[PDB]
C-alpha cells in the first residue's frame, strides 16, 4: 500500500501530540506529554484510495532537537499547528514554513495550516480570518481550525494533507 510520511510541527504547547494521538489512537492525551519525537501509524482511505500514514510528532520549535533538518528534508507533507489562543504561536509559523521551504529548496511542499484548540472560543486571540489570510499569503488554501479535545476536524487535517501529496 502507498505510505505517506507526514510531519506535525509548530511551537510548544499548541497540541501537536494531542492531534496526532487523537487521530491515530482516538484518545485525548489530557496532560500526558510525550517526550519522544515518535512516529504514529494509521491506515486511511481518502478519495477511494488507501494510504498508510506514518506521522512524526515533533518537539515544539523552541525545544532542542538535532533531527529537525532531517525531518524537514524527508517529510512528504507538513501540518503547521498553532493555537487560536496564542498569537505568538501563529506568527511563529511564518519562520517555520520558510525553514521548511529552505531545506527543501522549493515552494512546492504539501502543507496544511491548523489552528488548534478551537474549543477554546472564549480564549480566542487569533481570528479565523487571520488564518485564512495567512493561507492566502502562502498561496495554499489548506487551512482548518481543529480541536484535539473535542474531535473537531482532527481526521480532516490528515485527509486534507494526503490530498496534497496525492
Q: Which residues bind ligand GNP (CB under 6 A)?
A: 12-18, 29-31, 33, 59-60, 116-117, 119-120, 147-149
Asked if 20 touches Mg ion (CB under 5 A), the answer is no
Write the DSSP string, 12-27.
Answer: TTSSHHHHHHHHHHS-
131 is in an annotated binding site: no
Question: Closest CB to ligand GNP among 51 and 115?
Answer: 115
The CA–CA distances, whole Å, from 102 to 33, 62, 96, 98 equal 30, 19, 10, 6
Restricted to residues 80-139, the positions that interact with Mg ion (CB under 5 A) are: none
Q: Which C-beta is closer to ligand GNP: that of 51 or that of 154?
A: 154
Residue 44 contact, options ligand GNP, Mg ion, none, Cβ 5-8 Å cut-off depending on partner type: none
Give the three cell numbers for residue 32: 500526558
Per residue in 31-57, is it b (16+ CB within 10 Å) or e — as a string? eeeeeebeebebeeebeeeebebebbb
Out of 4, 7, 17, 79, the only residue in the binding site for Mg ion (CB under 5 A) is 17
What are 57's three cell numbers?
A: 510528532
Asked if 61 is part of the footprint of Mg ion (rule: CB under 5 A), the reply reads no
Distance CA 38, CA 59 (A): 10
Nearer to Mg ion, 57 or 138 (CB): 57
In whole angstroms, the minimum distance from the beta carbon of 64 to ligand GNP comes to: 11
SS3 content of the chain, % helix, strand, coil (to 5): 35, 25, 40
Write out the binding residues for GTP. 10-18, 57-61, 116-119, 147-149
Chain positions contacting Mg ion, by CB under 5 A: 16-17
Amino acid at each position: 500500500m502507498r505510505e505517506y510520511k507526514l510531519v506535525v510541527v509548530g511551537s510548544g504547547g499548541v497540541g501537536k501530540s494531542a492531534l496526532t494521538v487523537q487521530f491515530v489512537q482516538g484518545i485525548f492525551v489530557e496532560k500526558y506529554d510525550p517526550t519522544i519525537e515518535d512516529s504514529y501509524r494509521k491506515q486511511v482511505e481518502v478519495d477511494a484510495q488507501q494510504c498508510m500514514l506514518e506521522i512524526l510528532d515533533t518537539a515544539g520549535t523552541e525545544q532542542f532537537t538535532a533531527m529537525r533538518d532531517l525531518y524537514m528534508k524527508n517529510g512528504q507533507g507538513f501540518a503547521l499547528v498553532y493555537s487560536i489562543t496564542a498569537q505568538s504561536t501563529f506568527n511563529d509559523l511564518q519562520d517555520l514554513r520558510e525553514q521548511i521551504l529552505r531545506v527543501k529548496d522549493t515552494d512546492d511542499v504539501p502543507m496544511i495550516l491548523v489552528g488548534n484548540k478551537c474549543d477554546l472560543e472564549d480564549e480566542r486571540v487569533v481570528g479565523k480570518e487571520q488564518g485564512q489570510n495567512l493561507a492566502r499569503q502562502w498561496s495554499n488554501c489548506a487551512f482548518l481550525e481543529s480541536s484535539a479535545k473535542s474531535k473537531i476536524n482532527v481526521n480532516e487535517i490528515f485527509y486534507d494533507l494526503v490530498r496534497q501529496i496525492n
